[PDB]
Amino acid sequence: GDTRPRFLEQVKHECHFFNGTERVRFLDRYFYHQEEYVRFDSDVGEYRAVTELGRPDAEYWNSQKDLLEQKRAAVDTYCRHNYGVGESFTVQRRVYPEVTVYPAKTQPLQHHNLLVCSVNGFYPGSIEVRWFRNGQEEKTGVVSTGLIQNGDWTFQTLVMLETVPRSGEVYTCQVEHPSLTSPLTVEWRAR
Template sequence: MVLCIPVSPWVAALMVLLSRGIQGGAPPDNHLLRALHECYAEDNRTQRYVMRCILDREEFMRFDSTVGEFRALTAMGRPWAESWNSQKEYMERRRAEVDTVCRHNYELNQGFTVKRRVQPKVHVSPSKKVALQHHGLLVCHATDFYPGNIQVRWFRNGQEETAGVVSTNLIRNGDWTFQILVMLEMTPQGGDVYTCHVEHPSLQSPITVEWKVRSDSARNKMLTGVCGLVLGLIFLAVGTTMHLRCKKAQLRAPGSP
């Protein structure tokens, strides 16, 4: 956040720095004098404004709206704080920043920040091929959601799993959305149903995504059915092609009806 800073205090500060070099008879050193302005808000009622005064890389003085005056953080900051605190009009403007800047910007931007809601997309998959009664890892991936507060839980056959749950930190996508990975260590048994349960402020009801364990026999039956379907389609295609060829041959034969 960039704010307009009264000229006189900063001009005075620069004059002090320049005078050091002039008094020494040598060109002054290069210094960087900065003022950082920060707003903290839990809601529109609870606002806090902070101004940090930094010379080069050292913060030497700070104004906090909860305190209402400048406080020196180093020996160099003491005369500055005393001087600025004695300027009544300047201090009144500084104390008003919590309303004129922080609260104003909060109300201006809350539609995009505070009130913005984007529903998560949830996908569940094993980290590798899973075999019955063998250790495995299920991954619940929630992505493209906003705001960042989200709760992801794992259930096995309707019972919440707390042991063996590992989560990444919240990952920023760089477009005002987040993602998170929550893993569950498991040893699947035949018929087990694992559920990823996601709660988020954008949702009226939780998102639940199931992952079911399939036995080898069930998998084999499914593969057999798929193979049978594919073979049936092949035979159908071959039969149709042969039928059409025979029909064309009959049409070309002499004396054919």
């Protein structure tokens, strides 16, 4: 119903952390709608225009010698500071995956099926999910959602295996995750 034009300003104060806080990169970024127009990159050490829209800000801000000395210290006063504050519940956050395995379809053996490995509730995002048939890795016929961020400091991923289940077979889903000291495996005996 609205008849009216919208205008959006964004700002992103980014702290990028490498090997702990050994190397830190501070990036102050300014955006008009989705267009970055000017930034301070600690690697560069002054404001730079990202687009021509940016130039009056970059020239004017780069004339303010105390604004520069302050932005130049931010890796320490802002980035390293905030890392110390949140480290214990962000960096150190680890939540086990829950692993469920089921056939996508209920049906007799000797028919094509998808075996679902649902891996849920885990943190952080890095994970490896592998499929095995009678102890041998299945590298073909694997369909993954990839990583789903749930927005509540947990992730999930569904890794499906294409197969024709036969009477002898045992299928194992194996998960590796920073929360786990050794790999977590769940079996499905062809039913």
